[PDB]
Scaffold this active site. Structure first.
Site, short mmCIF file in Angstrom:
data_model
loop_
_atom_site.label_atom_id
_atom_site.label_comp_id
_atom_site.label_asym_id
_atom_site.label_seq_id
_atom_site.Cartn_x
_atom_site.Cartn_y
_atom_site.Cartn_z
N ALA A 35 0.74 -1.26 -0.08
CA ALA A 35 0.03 -0.02 0.00
C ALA A 35 0.68 1.25 -0.19
O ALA A 35 0.52 2.50 -0.62
CB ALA A 35 -0.76 0.22 1.17
N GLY A 37 3.89 1.72 -1.21
CA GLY A 37 4.84 1.65 -2.55
C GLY A 37 5.88 0.48 -2.54
O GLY A 37 5.75 -0.36 -1.85
N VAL A 39 9.60 -0.73 -2.49
CA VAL A 39 11.03 -0.46 -2.09
C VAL A 39 11.94 -1.14 -2.83
O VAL A 39 12.06 -2.62 -2.67
CB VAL A 39 11.12 -0.52 -0.45
CG1 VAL A 39 12.50 -0.27 0.05
CG2 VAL A 39 10.19 0.29 0.14
N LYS A 58 12.24 4.21 -2.32
CA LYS A 58 10.73 3.93 -2.33
C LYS A 58 9.85 4.92 -3.41
O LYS A 58 10.36 6.03 -3.52
CB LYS A 58 10.11 4.22 -0.81
CG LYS A 58 8.97 3.94 -0.81
CD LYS A 58 8.74 3.76 0.70
CE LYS A 58 7.39 2.76 0.99
NZ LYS A 58 7.08 2.42 2.24
N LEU A 99 20.51 2.22 3.02
CA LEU A 99 20.22 0.76 3.15
C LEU A 99 20.40 0.31 4.76
O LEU A 99 21.65 0.51 5.07
CB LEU A 99 20.88 0.05 2.03
CG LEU A 99 20.20 -1.54 1.94
CD1 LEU A 99 18.76 -1.70 1.45
CD2 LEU A 99 21.10 -2.01 0.80
N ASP A 144 1.46 3.60 11.56
CA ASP A 144 1.58 2.38 10.91
C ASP A 144 2.97 2.03 11.66
O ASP A 144 3.92 1.06 11.05
CB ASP A 144 1.93 2.37 9.48
CG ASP A 144 1.85 1.05 8.55
OD1 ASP A 144 1.37 0.06 9.54
OD2 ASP A 144 2.33 0.85 7.76
N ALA A 147 6.25 -4.56 13.44
CA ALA A 147 7.67 -5.00 13.25
C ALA A 147 8.37 -5.04 11.83
O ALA A 147 9.56 -4.95 11.61
CB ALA A 147 7.61 -6.51 13.77
N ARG A 148 7.09 -4.90 11.00
CA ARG A 148 7.65 -4.89 9.67
C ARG A 148 8.34 -3.47 9.28
O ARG A 148 8.96 -3.55 8.30
CB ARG A 148 6.36 -5.16 8.72
CG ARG A 148 6.41 -4.70 7.18
CD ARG A 148 5.01 -4.79 6.72
NE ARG A 148 4.01 -3.92 7.60
CZ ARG A 148 3.48 -2.64 7.24
NH1 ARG A 148 3.81 -2.14 6.16
NH2 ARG A 148 2.85 -2.16 8.10
N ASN A 149 7.91 -2.55 9.97
CA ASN A 149 8.40 -1.20 9.83
C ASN A 149 9.65 -0.71 10.69
O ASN A 149 9.88 0.48 11.08
CB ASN A 149 7.39 -0.29 10.11
CG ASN A 149 6.65 -0.08 8.36
OD1 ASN A 149 7.10 -0.38 7.44
ND2 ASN A 149 5.21 0.38 8.57
N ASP A 162 9.31 4.48 7.92
CA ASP A 162 7.98 4.86 7.08
C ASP A 162 6.97 5.74 7.88
O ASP A 162 5.72 5.58 7.64
CB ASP A 162 7.32 3.44 6.77
CG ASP A 162 6.90 3.48 5.41
OD1 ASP A 162 7.41 4.00 4.34
OD2 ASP A 162 5.67 2.71 5.11
C1 GW7 Z 1 13.48 -5.43 4.33
C2 GW7 Z 1 14.60 -4.97 4.13
C3 GW7 Z 1 14.78 -3.36 3.96
C4 GW7 Z 1 16.01 -2.57 4.22
C5 GW7 Z 1 15.75 -1.35 4.42
N1 GW7 Z 1 16.81 -0.23 4.39
C6 GW7 Z 1 16.35 0.98 4.40
N2 GW7 Z 1 14.89 1.40 3.94
C7 GW7 Z 1 14.26 0.56 3.82
N3 GW7 Z 1 12.84 0.73 3.44
C8 GW7 Z 1 12.36 1.93 3.31
C9 GW7 Z 1 11.20 2.41 3.86
C10 GW7 Z 1 10.77 3.64 3.65
C11 GW7 Z 1 11.26 4.43 2.91
O1 GW7 Z 1 10.74 5.77 2.59
C12 GW7 Z 1 9.71 6.39 3.75
C13 GW7 Z 1 10.24 7.12 4.70
C14 GW7 Z 1 9.76 7.40 5.62
C15 GW7 Z 1 10.15 7.98 6.70
C16 GW7 Z 1 11.59 8.31 6.72
C17 GW7 Z 1 12.39 8.08 5.61
F1 GW7 Z 1 13.90 7.92 5.75
C18 GW7 Z 1 11.85 7.32 4.61
C19 GW7 Z 1 12.43 4.02 2.23
CL1 GW7 Z 1 13.11 5.22 1.33
C20 GW7 Z 1 12.76 2.78 2.38
C21 GW7 Z 1 14.35 -0.78 4.01
S1 GW7 Z 1 13.62 -2.39 3.72
#
Ligand code: GW7
Length: 292
Positions: A35, A37, A39, A58, A99, A144, A147-149, A162
């Site tokens: 929902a 977007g 990643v 994202k 990352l 939101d 644990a997933r976030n 997120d």
């Molecule tokens: C499951 C494996 C993962 C490793 C990982 N490393 C970094 N970021 C990941 N996901 C991710 C989630 C949200 C993102 O953008 C939304 C956001 C919201 C608030 C602050 C941000 F910097 C950003 C963005 Cl840009 C990225 C993830 S997911």
């Protein structure tokens, strides 16, 4: 004329947001999609530089509100919250963040189940609560938390991600239409199921559900129970069960997060402090075999 001066001792926000060229970014593969977007795992090579910075990108499926939310996300400076590194405006707006090499906490707990101890689990409860504490201080509701976030920088260091996106995509309209909400019902505070009544205390509910996921090493909340039935069950007093490893001490903390009265729930300040003292004597509070 010249504008009438009226200082407020609030410190300047010197956060940097980098506007990135489309070509500074490469996508390796997909990490997740939903929902919120898609990643992507990716590589950022800054303009003129050489280093290939590991990033997540994202993409989302109004723009004044986006650039406003992007300011909030870039301003976050806390060890247990992520920070937005950059925004790419083309072809559609892309969010770029560092990352996290050990990935998502929900996946990490399930995979490393047989080697996660009480100290580690109790320390994550503190770090999550601390990051939320920092959000609340800024009057920011996550909406939101799950644990997933929560992402794993290293085993002993998690970050919340997120925040903000939910409100950006949904809005603040009290009444749900036929489309309903974008966040999963099973992490949602009861009052937010019926209307959009999102507050710090609703996040606390979600915190309770998030820490239950961890104590069950990636357990699925109300597993099998269809999402249509949840609002009725919760109102009849149904709550998540006591995880086997949990002492009544830890479970009661969880249960208090799921009080009907939002004001009756623990504040994030109390949650961090309690799990802090539990983390000083973690075997008195979580009972995992081999944990010597
Ligand atoms: C499951 C494996 C993962 C490793 C990982 N490393 C970094 N970021 C990941 N996901 C991710 C989630 C949200 C993102 O953008 C939304 C956001 C919201 C608030 C602050 C941000 F910097 C950003 C963005 Cl840009 C990225 C993830 S997911």
């Amino acid at each position: 004329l010249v504008e009438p001066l009226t200082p407020s001792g609030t410190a300047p926000n010197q956060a940097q947001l980098r506007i990135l060229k489309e070509t500074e970014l490469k996508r390796v593969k997909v990490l997740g999609s939903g929902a919120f977007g898609t990643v992507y795992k990716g590589i950022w090579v800054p303009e003129g530089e050489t280093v290939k910075i590991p990033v997540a990108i994202k993409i989302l499926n109004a723009n004044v509100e986006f650039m406003d939310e992007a300011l909030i996300m870039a301003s976050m400076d806390h060890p247990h919250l992520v920070r937005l590194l950059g925004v790419c405006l083309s072809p559609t707006i892309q969010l770029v963040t560092q990352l996290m090499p050990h990935g998502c906490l929900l996946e990490y707990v399930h995979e490393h189940k047989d080697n996660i101890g009480s100290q580690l689990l109790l320390n994550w409860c503190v770090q999550i609560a601390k990051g939320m504490m920092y959000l609340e201080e800024r009057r920011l509701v996550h909406r939101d938390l799950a644990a997933r976030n929560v992402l794993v920088k290293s085993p002993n260091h998690v970050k919340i991600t997120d925040f903000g996106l939910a409100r950006l995509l949904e809005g603040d309209e009290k009444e749900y239409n036929a489309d309903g909400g974008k966040m999963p019902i099973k992490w949602m505070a009861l009052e937010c199921i019926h209307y959009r009544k999102f507050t710090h205390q609703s996040d606390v509910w979600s915190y309770g559900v998030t820490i239950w996921e961890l104590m069950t090493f990636g357990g699925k909340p109300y597993d099998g129970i269809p999402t249509r039935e949840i609002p009725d069950l919760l109102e009849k007093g149904e709550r998540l069960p006591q995880p086997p490893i949990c002492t009544i001490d830890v479970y009661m903390v969880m249960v208090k997060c799921w009080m009907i009265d939002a004001d009756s729930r623990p504040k994030f300040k109390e949650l961090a402090a309690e799990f802090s003292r539990m983390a000083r004597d973690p075997q008195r509070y979580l009972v995992i075999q081999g944990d010597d």
